[PDB]
Amino acid sequence: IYSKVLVTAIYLALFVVGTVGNGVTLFTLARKKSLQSLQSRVDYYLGSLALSDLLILLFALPVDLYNFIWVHHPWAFGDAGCKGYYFLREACTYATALNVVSLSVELYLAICHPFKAKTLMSRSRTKKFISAIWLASALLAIPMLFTMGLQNLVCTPIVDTATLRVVIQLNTFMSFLFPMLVASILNTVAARRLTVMVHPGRVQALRRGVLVLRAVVIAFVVCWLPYHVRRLMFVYITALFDFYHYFYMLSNALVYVSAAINPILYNLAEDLVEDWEKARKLLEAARKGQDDEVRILLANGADVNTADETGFTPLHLAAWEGHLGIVEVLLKNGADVNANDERGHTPLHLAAYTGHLEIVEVLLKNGAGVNATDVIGTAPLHLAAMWGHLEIVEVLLKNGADVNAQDKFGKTPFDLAIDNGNEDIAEVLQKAATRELEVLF
């Protein structure tokens, strides 16, 4: 009896947040206009999946909560509500299945037949086609009007178990399993081709669409499998009989919980990957040298102080690749000049390494740590003397570089200069050293 309240509270909560959630999602994707066509066509399929979820929450859930609340009470929705409850529930399972299949085809064609896709696909055609999806869904659901009926009050099948075993089997085959098999094959083949095509506005959309499709396909199996499993049992199939009763109950809730959380989830997940893509784009743009792309991303709201798995900020990559323009703009939008990575390298280490003179100047001008030492004990002057960048050694020494600094290997930059046959560079450190001796006295 106590559980009834607990289930009610949970079931009511799922209803209000589920209806409003899917409603907001429906109204949002409606207003939403994207320049990339596929972005739109993806959102059309995401609309009809939110509609399918909303219908089930408005029409089906309330009937269940009554069936749960009033156990073994008369069916109080008439023969119309009886036949209709299963029509809508069957009409939505088809709609969802045809959407995830239609979406996966459009996204397969995009990647694997682009110059066949360009000549076939359009926002208008997708919109007109998603109508056909809901028609087919309604026509495929018509048989459930005749299978279910009212008797003595129970909304129970009004047809033989033989004829009923057929429809349940035909339902589960192409409202599930067929879509699952088609979605996973097409999305796999496409995703493999996509990761190869990497090894532009349209190309961005594809990576988004493939993520979306893998997210909805995983969300589709977790929700509808225990349900369709439960259905499949009726067709084929004690003390555990009462224990297998819990599965039936658990499978219903799952369809509802999923349908209610998916909007709250998708939006939560979209935000994270939305920024994760911006940050990933900035790092690529910085290292590549697309000074244009960087400008756009920083305005968009990309994190100036992003990092790699290694701990390479954009300023590390720009300084390393020697993109003075990108270095200048990164510092302009408040990049950490003294930022460290795993090995403990600052940008000034990398600009002294590759030997970009003016970047070394800019980093120091914007307050770079001149003596900054890494894990191995190495400093920027070690690296300039190592590669023999005489001009960089000059400015480093000029900006208060420690000519004496030794590493873990017990080698100073003076030694490294000699050890690389850099006769000129070595001569400058000797001069610099004896000057430091005289001020020390």
Ligand SMILES: COc1cccc(OC)c1-c1cc(C(=O)N[C@]2(C(=O)O)[C@@H]3C[C@H]4C[C@H](C[C@@H]2C4)C3)nn1-c1ccnc2cc(Cl)ccc12
């Ligand atoms: C022989 O059936 C099973 C055997 C083993 C496990 C089962 O479910 C966990 C089932 C099963 C499936 C359905 C099952 O899927 N009913 C429906 C439903 O979804 O509500 C009903 C009946 C038809 C038309 C329509 C849609 C389908 C199939 C309404 N109902 N159902 C059950 C039938 C009879 N007694 C059961 C007792 C227990 Cl403890 C659990 C399940 C039972």
